Amino acid sequence: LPDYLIKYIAIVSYEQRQNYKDDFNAEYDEYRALHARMETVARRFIKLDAQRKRLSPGSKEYQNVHEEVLQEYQKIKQSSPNYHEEKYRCEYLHNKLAHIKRMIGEFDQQQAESW
Amino acid sequence: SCVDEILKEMTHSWPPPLTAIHTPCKTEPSKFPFPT
């Protein structure tokens, strides 16, 4: 059970909304940087996958794609800090910030229902 | 074979990045089911 689900509960006041928003903003920069790296890393392999699917398996191009997948994966395996630690950090921040934003949005909806 | 496993691990679709918190909230967030 992630800690942010215990910490960030339903909002009861605008001051709480402000605090939640400030906490979101305090990690937003790291989140966006990591997310951008994750998308950039994924893009190369999604591209290689699509190429591999549309190519004849008897073509030199196919072998080239194979090799390029191996080389790029080697780049990822040797990266520092470890790719999997960055990925975990990015998933955690995504769902944490998504949860905080969910609390804020549900609060906004409630407030709009009463005025 | 090994390349197949590599691509299975690296081609998962990431959700778009969360936007900043507008006032009131402009975009509805959601928890994402990341693969495990």
- Domain extent, residue A115, equals 1-115
- Chain A positions in Cβ-Cβ contact with residue B14 (cut-off 8 Å): 35, 38-39, 42
Measure B36 CA to nearest chain A CA, in Å.
Answer: 11
Instruction: Answer yes or no: are the C-beta atoms of A34 and A100 closer than 8 Å.
Output: no
User: Which of B2, B13, B18 has the most A C-beta neighbours within 10 Å, making it the best mutation to test the interface with A?
Assistant: B18
DSSP code per residue over A21-86: HHHHHHHHHHHHHHHHHHHHHHHHHHHHHHHHHHS-TTSHHHHHHHHHHHHHHHHHHH-SS-HHHH
Return the H-helix or E-strand segment holding A2. Answer: none
- B6 CB-side CA count, 13 A: 23
- Three-state secondary structure readout of A77-103: HHCCCCHHHHHHHHHHHHHHHHHHHHH
Domain count, chain A: 1
Sign of the alpha-carbon dihedral angle for B11, A50, A44, A40: negative
Say yes or no for a CB contact (<8 Å) between A25 and B20.
yes
Peptide bond into B29 cis (omega under 30): no
Q: Which technique?
A: X-ray
Q: Does B35 touch chain A (CB under 8 A)?
A: no
Position of tokens 């009463």? Answer: A114
- Judged by a CB distance cut-off of 8 A, whether residue B34 touches chain A is yes
How far apart (Å, rounded) are the C-alpha atoms in residues B14 and B11?
9
Tell me how far apart the alpha carbons of residues A45 and B6 are, in angstroms, rounded to a whole number: 9
Contact A98, A2 (CB under 8 A): no
Among candidates B15, B9, B1, B11, which has minimal Cα distance to B36? B9
B10 touches chain A (CB under 8 A): yes
Contact predicate A52/A67, CB 8 Å: no
